[PDB]
């Protein structure tokens, strides 16, 4: 889903891994509103060809 | 295996790669002590075959072979020596201001005589000074030479980015803006196919010599009719003019450039990323 999702993303590069002063540091992240405007989500799109949604009014 | 190294030990009587750039389109000098004999042969007898017997003999005067044979010819050494020959003057002659201040026209003046003497007795300068590569390393001594300047496919212009993190290495100059002939002004997207053509004029301009690179997205079968068109030096009759081999593919037309900064201000074209298909020569018409 989410935690199961990137757990193979870290592993994919992991098996591809075999294949005078400080203050050199800045930090960063961005979430929270990163789900609000999105205003829905389906995760896990597999090998897919066509997505249909039909409307009945 | 998309990485190779080649090495030939010669003199710095020729190119002096310490005086060259990191990127130079080096020729060898295959059959170096040759051509007293083929001066006599392969020509009709109205050519007075005792000319090249002395002509190359004055070249190595300016440069005894010893155990370090005469070879590793620069790209500069043909452009400036033909600068007075072909149809570009005071701009191709800026290559002579590049050589004589860094390399020497003493070796040019003996060889510009050869460029009127080799082509005289039908000893045409194709299939002599065969292609070697792009001057990777210059592990040469003071007055002697030991160069690794790899042949052998695309790896010469891949192994340029990997060695130095800052900017780019070699990046394959054209060494004259008059050179890299801007053929196909009928412009479109694709990949570039580079070739090495010696265009001649036999007894009209008194055995003309020319060295420049073409620019085309054209096959070898679409290049020979492209060698019959676009020329004005047809006015000959002997024959077998305009030889060419494959300098290989530049698999990008986007990375060509326009500069005048090198090493004397000489115009120069950056060409990044090249499949160096070594190719083969052809000279019949």
């Amino acid at each position: 889903e989410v935690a199961s999702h990137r757990r193979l993303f870290d592993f994919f590069a992991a098996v591809r891994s075999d294949e005078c002063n400080t203050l050199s540091l800045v930090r960063f992240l961005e979430l929270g509103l990163s789900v609000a405007c999105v205003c829905t989500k389906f995760p896990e799109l597999a090998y897919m060809n066509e997505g249909r949604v039909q409307f009945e009014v | 295996p998309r990485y190779h190294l080649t090495r030939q030990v010669t003199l710095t009587d020729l190119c002096q790669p310490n005086a060259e750039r990191a990127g130079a389109l080096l020729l060898a000098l295959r059959h170096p002590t040759d051509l007293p004999h083929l001066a006599r042969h392969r020509a009709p007898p109205g050519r007075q075959t005792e000319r090249l017997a002395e002509a190359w003999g004055q070249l190595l005067e300016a440069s005894e072979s010893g155990c370090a044979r005469a070879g590793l010819v620069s790209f500069n050494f043909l452009v400036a020596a033909c600068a007075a020959a072909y149809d570009a003057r005071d701009a191709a002659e800026a290559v002579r201001a590049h050589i004589t201040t860094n390399y020497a026209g003493a070796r040019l003046d003996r060889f510009s005589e050869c460029l009127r003497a080799m082509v005289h007795t039908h000893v045409f300068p194709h299939e002599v000074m065969r292609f070697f590569g792009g001057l990777v390393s210059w592990v040469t001594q003071d007055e002697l030479a030991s160069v690794t300047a790899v042949c052998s496919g695309p790896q010469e212009a891949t192994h340029t980015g990997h060695p130095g993190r800052p900017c780019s290495a070699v990046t394959i100059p054209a060494c004259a803006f008059v050179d890299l002939d801007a053929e196909l002004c009928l412009g479109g997207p694709g990949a570039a196919f580079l070739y090495l053509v010696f265009t001649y004029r036999q007894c009209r301009d008194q055995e003309l010599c020319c060295v420049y690179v073409v620019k085309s997205q054209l096959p070898p079968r679409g290049l020979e009719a492209a060698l019959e068109r676009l020329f004005g030096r047809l006015r000959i009759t002997t024959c077998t003019y305009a030889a060419f081999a494959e300098l290989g593919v530049m698999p990008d037309d986007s990375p060509r450039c326009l500069h005048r900064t090198e090493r004397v201000g000489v115009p120069v074209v950056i060409l990044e990323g090249v499949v160096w298909r070594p190719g083969g020569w052809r000279a019949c018409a």
């Binding site: - | 009709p44 007898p45 694709g190 077998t240 019949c284």
Partner: protein
């Protein structure tokens, strides 16, 4: 491979998607080197020039200035093609489809010829994308060089009439048996004319000064005719050599130029190159790993580099 793709641009006739599946191993002439390209320059409507379609000699000249490409894998979204002119660096020996009536050999050079056969038109039609497709016919190269000389000389007979209407058709071919009849429908003149001129102009330069001494030994040829087998079989019946039999011209300047050796050089320069300047260059060679000595019609033969 230096991968090059051609996408499926707009819509699909649902059986015709399967028609693109059975074209695996065929050849696309795409006049570029692209990372992506439309399917519009692919078909024969792009082979058609301004207003007029090429003849089977013009299609040779149309297949001159374009680039062949091998169908590698067929997706419903794209078709991955490998650029024959550059990307033949395949130790995996990217595979081709033989669409030809001749069972070939092992070890043949293979050059491409337009469809000119009487029954192997290779015409597949797309109506959703209105395009016509002529696949080239891969053939062995001596059999390929036996064809192009016929079709130009058939168009040489398109310049002059003169003779009675019963002409030798140039339309019966011979491979070990196997009577082949091809199509003679239209002969465009400029495709004949430019092909005829290089047949003239190269045969000009292929004669030299020392060549003339060989012409003296034409009566020497028939002296070997009635005294061996090899020569008499070499001497053709439909030849001018048996017809012309029914001298140094001194002009000797210097005589240290090797005049006889210099004759065979420039003759080979232009008369030695007559198959490849008229037709397409061979770069495909028959190479099967299993020890199979021939490759059937319709098979998938492994393909190696320039001969």
């Amino acid at each position: 491979c230096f991968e090059a793709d051609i996408a499926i641009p707009s819509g699909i006739s649902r059986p015709d998607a399967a028609a693109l599946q059975r074209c695996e191993g065929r050849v696309v002439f795409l006049p570029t080197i692209r990372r992506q390209l439309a399917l519009a320059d692919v078909a024969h409507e792009s082979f058609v020039s301004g207003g007029v379609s090429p003849d089977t000699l013009g299609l040779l000249l149309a297949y001159r200035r374009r680039f062949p490409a091998v169908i590698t894998r067929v997706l419903p979204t794209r078709i991955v093609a490998c650029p024959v002119d550059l990307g033949l660096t395949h130790a995996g020996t990217v595979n081709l489809r033989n669409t030809s009536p001749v069972d070939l050999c092992n070890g043949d050079p293979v050059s491409l010829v337009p469809p000119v056969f009487e029954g192997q038109a290779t015409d597949v039609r797309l109506e959703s994308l209105d395009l016509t497709l002529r696949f080239p016919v891969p053939l062995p190269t001596p059999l390929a060089r036996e064809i192009v000389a016929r079709l130009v000389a058939r168009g040489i007979r398109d310049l002059n009439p003169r003779t009675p209407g019963e002409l030798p058709d140039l339309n019966v071919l011979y491979y070990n048996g196997a009577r082949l009849s091809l199509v003679a429908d239209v002969q465009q003149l400029a495709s004949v004319n430019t092909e005829l001129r290089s047949l003239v102009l190269n045969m000009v330069y292929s004669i030299t000064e020392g060549t003339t001494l060989i012409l003296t030994l034409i009566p020497r040829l028939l002296a070997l005719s009635a005294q061996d087998g090899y020569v008499n079989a070499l001497l053709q019946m439909q030849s001018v050599t048996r017809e012309a039999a029914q001298a140094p011209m001194l002009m000797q300047d210097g005589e240290r130029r090797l005049p006889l050796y210099e004759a065979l050089v420039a003759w080979l320069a232009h008369a030695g190159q007559l198959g490849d300047i008229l037709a397409l260059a061979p770069a495909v060679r028959v190479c099967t790993f299993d020890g199979a000595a021939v490759v059937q019609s319709g098979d998938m033969a492994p393909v190696i580099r320039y001969p």
